[PDB]
Amino acid sequence: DEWSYTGSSFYAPEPITSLNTKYVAPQVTYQNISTNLPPPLLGNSTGI
Amino acid sequence: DEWSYTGSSFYAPEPITSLNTKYVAPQVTYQNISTNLPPPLLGNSTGI
Description:
The structure is cut from a larger assembly and holds 2 copies of chain A. By secondary structure, chain A is mainly β. The first copy, chain A, contains no helices and 2 strands. A two-stranded antiparallel sheet of chain A has the order 1-2. At the A-B interface, loops of A face loops of B. Chains A, B: Acts as a viral fusion peptide which is unmasked following S2 cleavage occurring upon virus endocytosis. Chains A, B: It comes from Middle East respiratory syndrome-related coronavirus (isolate United Kingdom/H123990006/2012).
């Protein structure tokens, strides 16, 4: 259940990053991911 | 003097957040808020 990103006009899966995603409000149709958490969804909890 | 956000085509006040706002250069016609500081304008000053 890994998730990748592809362009709308050509099939070529790529890693999900902040350059191809945008933050949005939650919806009932969205997938709730538990593991492997692509970098944009990584909640930063690395303090001193 | 609370400020809310509404969609351009239907009146329904909502809280101000980073999802419905965008950062811009200051203008002379902007309101200078002192209290209640919606979350986008909250200057983070929480170190250890």
